[PDB]
Amino acid sequence: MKSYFVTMGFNETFLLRLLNETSAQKEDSLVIVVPSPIVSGTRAAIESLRAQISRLNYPPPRIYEIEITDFNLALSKILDIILTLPEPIISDLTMGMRMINTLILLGIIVSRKRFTVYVRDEGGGSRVISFNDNTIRALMRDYSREEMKLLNVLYETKGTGITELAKMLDKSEKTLINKIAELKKFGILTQKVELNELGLNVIKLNKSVI
Amino acid sequence: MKSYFVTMGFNETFLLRLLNETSAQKEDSLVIVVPSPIVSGTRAAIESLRAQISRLNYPPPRIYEIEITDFNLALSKILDIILTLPEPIISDLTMGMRMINTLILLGIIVSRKRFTVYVRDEGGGSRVISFNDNTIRALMRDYSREEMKLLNVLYETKGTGITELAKMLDKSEKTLINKIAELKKFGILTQKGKDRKVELNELGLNVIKLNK
Structure with a gap:
């Protein structure tokens, strides 16, 4: 089994795309972290997501709502989640609060866990970038x-x-x-x-080093 | 001198806030990368920004457009910018295309240059997080x-x-x-x-x- 770790805003479609593209299994771990309180637009996206996940035999999501007031205090909570996830951790940073996506990316990187990250065109175009732990290891x-x-x-x-x-x-x-x-x-x-x-x-x- | 390196969408407010909060000087290097082609919303934001920067005696921006289709091709262009910037590099990831902000953050990290990054609430609340090269070095x-x-x-x-x-x-x-x-x-x-x-x-x- 592998894991999916993302945040969510008002649009569930990027996560459904991720799950499809990366052959999500019912047994995979899907964790979604959202800011507290969960606003109506996000609640609506989550209920739509859950319904479509059920239809598609996707991993049912565990959803956590968190405070995001300070880098290290929030990173601690993000790390608590990450250090429990089976590898590789798959993510897409196109959706939800920028602050949370930043913590997710940094947490995944410092965790030293295997990972693949996608970031798409937020306006709905086809352009996408992706990278993995090998990419970052090579550069670092x-x-x-x-x-x-x-x-x-x-x-x-x-x-x-x-x-x-x-x-x-x-x-x-x-x-x-x-x-x-x-x-x-x-x-x-x-x-x-x-x-x-x-x-x-x-x-x-x-x-540059030289 | 220090540098600022950001992207931009349709709202220049966050950059102006960054410049104010970090005591931007006229002699600092400000570089902004935007997606190509430049859309009218971004063109308007840039012209507003330029006008306000002049009035406030802030660093005048060098603005570059970039086509973003592949991780490594795009990172190459971002590194070409980064590896020339005086340190520390200051950035704010609240504005502009998510893919470009991702490349900026990763480029800054892998460059080994000193940096501070802010990310704020895109809704305009007071919440902000920040971190620097020490933060990442300590964790790694x-x-x-x-x-x-x-x-x-x-x-x-x-x-x-x-x-x-x-x-x-x-x-x-x-x-x-x-x-x-x-x-x-x-x-x-x-x-x-x-x-x-x-x-x-x-x-x-x-x-x-x-x-x-």
């Missing part, structure tokens, strides 16, 4: 000197084969193949070995 | 066994002086004083009053929770 990681050298060669060549890459780095093909295998799992390159767009953002950050 | 830090013992002691005792702590942890005052000074700089504990007792703060309580 402190790369070694030899790792940055390797990545920089891929950057400047727009990709190159193992044989050529091994000669430029003064490393054996065996050594390079193992290291490429590792970084491929880290999500920043593919294979001719090439950086992907996540790898290109790593290059940008590591220029 | 790896604490040692001996560190967690110290923190748990402070939790269980509800605060104690150096002298008493040294006895409880069986540590020299010197070593304890140094550690406390360190963790105080991380913002997770305080030392207050005439008794100078060392106490966890609310950030420290979250550190404990994460390392439970």
Whole structure:
């Protein structure tokens, strides 16, 4: 089982879209946190959501209402929820109070739990961004000197084969193949070995470090 | 100088409030990123903002439009902006497209730059939350066994002086004083009053929770 952790405003449709897109199971954990008191528009969205969840054999939601007056006091409550959720935690930040969505995102990140987050066009267009714990790990990681050298060669060549890459780095093909295998799992390159767009953002950050 | 980096929707009020509350100076760098194409509501808000900034001797904005369709492509553009900004970077996520605010926050965090972020009640109430690079660093830090013992002691005792702590942890005052000074700089504990007792703060309580 996995989990869904979101907030809610007046429109339940983004959550139903999330649940559909990510193949929600009846056995998955769905938690929704809302500000207290729960205003009429939010109550109406929740009753509509519940009805549609029943029809669609989706996970029935556990709904918690919370005070949001201070970063750390609110984060504590958000963490109480997160540290109980089975992984990965799936979320969509398009709906509900900005302050609550911020706490949800930050809580998920500092929890070190596996996660996928979506953020859509709030006006109903088709554009969407998503990222996961691998994305953030890749960006937040402190790369070694030899790792940055390797990545920089891929950057400047727009990709190159193992044989050529091994000669430029003064490393054996065996050594390079193992290291490429590792970084491929880290999500920043593919294979001719090439950086992907996540790898290109790593290059940008590591220029900053240099 | 410091920087401000925000997006914008149809209401400039929150940015003006941010600038006022954080003592914006003419010499500070203000950058605003907006979605492309620029819609009339946002164009109007920007013109109003520009007029008000001039009157108040606030930093004149550099405004950039961005197309937002993919996480990494868009983050690349956001990083190009961030990695040039003087620190600290100040932002407010209450205004503008949610996807852009998400990219701004993540960009600021992964940039390793000093920052403070505010998020307010979009309904115009007084509720606000804020956090900074220290907040995130404290929560993501790896604490040692001996560190967690110290923190748990402070939790269980509800605060104690150096002298008493040294006895409880069986540590020299010197070593304890140094550690406390360190963790105080991380913002997770305080030392207050005439008794100078060392106490966890609310950030420290979250550190404990994460390392439970």
